[PDB]
Symmetry: C3
Subunit: 445 residues, 3 copies
């Protein structure tokens, strides 16, 4: 529960420690079934407004079915496609005959049942909506006359409710070529999802975590539609399976670090590279570069290992002894000294250069701190907002202690004349070797 932060004055970086992990390592596939009604184009001679409204929505029903066949004609266009290979594999098994009828036989008794597929995969099936039973029992004998019948409007409105979810299904499948994420509430109702999470094979502790952070599970799950035949449409919904839980996570925040020399254009800078989410995973650390690829319920981190990067466990040494002999801490160099500010979880790192104003201000008591030229940090305690130049930043109000690690800025240890100031993705060893090789040429002079 304790959330900690440590600002590194020497490297102009901060690490937010005390976070718990939830890394997606596997995929669970579930087949969702809608029992459709195979009807041919009917036409009876009536002008009744009851049967007129039925024709309009039967057309919308028939159009959504025939268009979902047109989408079926479209081969999976998303990807990449590594992330959906499990759902595609289930779709391919549904093509085989004697598999669509297997689902139909197992779902006649109950709205949910486990089925063993031909590929040996044991998946749970769900008949969310039964259009077949309703349309044939309620609406078929009405319009099965020489002229359209005269039934009341109560049955027509209920038919609007049934057809409304199907229209919502085909409209989301069409714009996304049958692969939608996050899984909308119509692909799988929130009530249906919790029932699906309770069934699926994992512990009660792992089920409790997924059922509490539902929205995060929806954003890390794909809805894939596979086929339509035998009066049934089927689409597979992949669900994240998390194999790494409760391992240490920490987020690295980096800000430029320059010198404070007076004459303009005579300053060198460097910035810590590889900022983002770090989490221990199987004796190593998994790096997450892309922003918002990790979701975060407070104190818990949810990420996917597909957008990851494997790093050795010694990578955390760059947060203490950046000159460590074990790992190659990456930095980028430049002479651009623009004033910026990074909002970390328990404060804000501020890099103030030039004449631009840099202040941390509290709305009630006013400005509480004015930042001098350099890189510094302000604790979130008693600080509402932080301003840099003409840009206003707001500080997070998460409760926790923040530590200030004092240290000489490493940018002061380098000579500006032989300093390489255009290294996009370099390391300490490269900067150390490039300078010594540059000084090797000046000695021979």
């Amino acid at each position: 529960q304790n959330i900690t932060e440590e600002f590194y004055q020497s490297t102009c970086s901060a690490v937010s420690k005390g976070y718990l992990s939830a890394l997606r390592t596997g995929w669970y596939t579930s087949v969702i079934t809608i029992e459709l009604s195979n009807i041919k184009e009917n036409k009876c001679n009536g002008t009744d407004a009851k049967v007129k409204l039925i024709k309009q929505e039967l057309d919308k029903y028939k159009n959504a079915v025939t268009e979902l066949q047109l989408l079926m004609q479209s081969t999976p266009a998303t990807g990449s496609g590594s992330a959906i290979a499990s759902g595609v594999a289930v779709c391919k098994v549904l093509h085989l005959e004697g598999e669509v009828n297997k689902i139909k036989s197992a779902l006649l008794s109950t709205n949910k049942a486990v089925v063993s597929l031909s590929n040996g995969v044991s998946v749970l099936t769900f008949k969310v909506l039964d259009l077949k039973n309703y349309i044939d029992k309620q609406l078929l004998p009405i319009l099965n006359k020489q002229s359209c019948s005269i039934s009341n409007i109560e049955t027509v409105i209920e038919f609007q409710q049934k057809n409304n979810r199907l229209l919502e299904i085909t409209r989301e499948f069409s714009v996304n070529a049958g692969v939608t994420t996050p899984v909308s509430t119509y692909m799988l109702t929130n009530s249906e999802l919790l029932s699906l999470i309770n069934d699926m094979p994992i512990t009660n502790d792992q089920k409790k975590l997924m059922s509490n952070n539902v929205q995060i599970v929806r954003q890390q799950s794909y809805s894939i539609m596979c086929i339509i035949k035998e009066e049934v449409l089927a689409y597979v919904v992949q669900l994240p399976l998390y194999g790494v839980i409760d391992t240490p996570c920490w987020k690295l925040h980096t800000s430029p670090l320059c010198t404070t020399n007076t004459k303009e254009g005579s300053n060198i800078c460097l910035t810590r590279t590889d900022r983002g989410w770090y989490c221990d995973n199987a004796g190593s650390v998994s790096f997450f570069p892309q922003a918002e690829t990790c979701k975060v319920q407070s104190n818990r981190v949810f990420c996917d290992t597909m957008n990851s990067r494997t790093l050795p466990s010694e990578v955390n040494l760059c947060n203490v002894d950046i000159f460590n002999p074990k790992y190659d801490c990456k930095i980028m160099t430049s002479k651009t000294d623009v004033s910026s500010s990074v909002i970390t979880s328990l404060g804000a790192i501020v890099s103030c250069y030039g004449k631009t104003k840099c202040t941390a201000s509290n709305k009630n008591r006013g400005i509480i701190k004015t930042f001098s030229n350099g890189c510094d940090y302000v604790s979130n305690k008693g600080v509402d907002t932080v301003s840099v130049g003409n840009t206003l930043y707001y500080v997070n109000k998460q409760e926790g202690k923040s530590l200030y690690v004092k240290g000489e800025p490493i940018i002061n240890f380098y000579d500006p004349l032989v300093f390489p100031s255009d290294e996009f993705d370099a390391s300490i060893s490269q900067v150390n070797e490039k300078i010594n090789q540059s000084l090797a040429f000046i000695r021979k002079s």
Copy 2:
């Protein structure tokens, strides 16, 4: 109203002048209220189709309420979160007891009223939909029988209209974890928004601008949902507050500038860096790097100062005397001479290199100009489209004069042998210093 453009032949860049500003500097928070009905699971013994449709939507009603509580269990996952700290602060004050009842007491008389919160913030409250009064007065005494009643269908359909907006609210909150942008029409009706803009504290001139460009205000506003208790759901909608209006804005367009030497691979190039939106703000210029972070009703520019960058006022000198002694104009160098074209607001900059065709063509009279090797500009007058290689570009038809600033291309002033041709983010001073230091080594030879 006058829109001007100036192409700089020396730097292969153009500036579109004559634009008015609208920079977001603050946030106004408004609490939106939906009076919910606290009902326990009712079950009466009836098969009437009137009461059957009620049960279906009451389940959808109860499910949307209980799921919106599940979303409430999810801590704010978006961000960052600087941009929503004001809305979060209002959400936290709503948690305190004696605050939810304060909103309920002030909204019993009118559908809108200003409320003073515990945090000293004066915010306007809105009861958009009153589900509590309708459900209890119209539907409670019907189903408050030993068996479900037999009321007509007119009341059931009206209940579908009320429940439809709530289902639209929870479905948008669920996919976005309660933070949606742009604010949809269901979070706040267009009619409700104009009424909210008229009330809010600002001048009639600032209210007239927001009420005219509604869609731009929606795209720069966040909908945040805070809590559900005491038969009321509440969600705060932040609205942009613009403190900078009618200050000069101009958009910088840059295109590569190479040499025209015949032998392949013997050409050097450079391109002006920091292209995008520039607007004067409080004695300085605010730079906007990210595209589409600024919206633009013609002749008016709408941007947010959070995605900004503060630059000194002398930054505009890079558009005239790029060799100015005051500011360090940034350029990037390379030897890649690919033919490209940038569509500016009143024409198009064309960089033609190699043998690729570069023509400005009018659909009625045909090709009007053929571009030679180098960087040039064509006015939008009498020009419909511009083609480069196999890529077709269309020119904007905005009315205004365009000026051609003749000048020797600066790429011709540099010696290709000592020229650094791999500078990602460099400046004129660095290129000037790097070449002189390279020539310092050849003199000692």
Copy 3:
């Protein structure tokens, strides 16, 4: 139908050949019309629930019309705007009087008809919904009384169906400022689209391709709304027109290539630049850098030439003889040896460096291959997934042969001491020239 892949061991790259093209070269504009009803605010003295529901939706009807006028007040804010200049041009012609009435006269007889505009453009018009005829014939004489009438509910529900699509139109136009893509099913029904594709001028073969891959056409089409007047709203829907069909396409996949020296930090790397989609177009090759700018029904590639890049036909030589004297193959250099894996269409390229595990595993028989240090490739035959470190990758199951082109890795031909290892966007000639110039300084020593 044959899909081929060739892995290049010397360059650590693979090319997926055997694909067919479909490049968008032009735009076809179609005017979509909804005949609106011009009604003034009516108020009759009734409390009937039939006429009460009418007032609620007439307000939603009137609000959607008046708000769509507010959106009309917003000048086109999207772009750029090259891609929509054709639709904007049609919108501007609709402003001229005697043009809105021309559409109204030609659509009174049929729901679809071709119209010659003032700009000489021949466009097909579509009256998708006729709100004017329905509202005035069915609902006007009802409420045209001194007190609201007592008509039944069948007509009210049909009015809900008509007004529902209009509310769907204005809600999508509002969030996107009137420019939406992909074109939703409500901007143009799937049934209306196929009828539009059949009419439009092109061959039966080009019509058959568009009608089969409907969803891809929707994602490469824009819906633009132009004006509201004379009881008619109009919005233009641009449709892709493909001028390049059945030309060779191939996708280039690149992975880092490093050395295998034991001592850490003593390795140099290089990676092929310009990975993505390549397609021959008019005697040259069109390069597509941005991912997902090309859609892909299997065996067919759909791209837009606006996000393209024109390259000479000799660019394919970088896939065989990278040291070719005709073209300058671009590579980037670094010393970062991170283990990665690229999922190509018929396998996976794996770059294994360090101690990180690199295995290709089949779920039934287990691990089938362990990758040594370097860059290698594994065929999709009998391989389900491929793991690198803590990241799991899944292989595509597309059927086709894959060829292994053996060759000495070019990274072994370079001396690490004089090797430039920080070239972001460089070429072979630059690396060749930079090393020789570095060796020119060591000879004079």
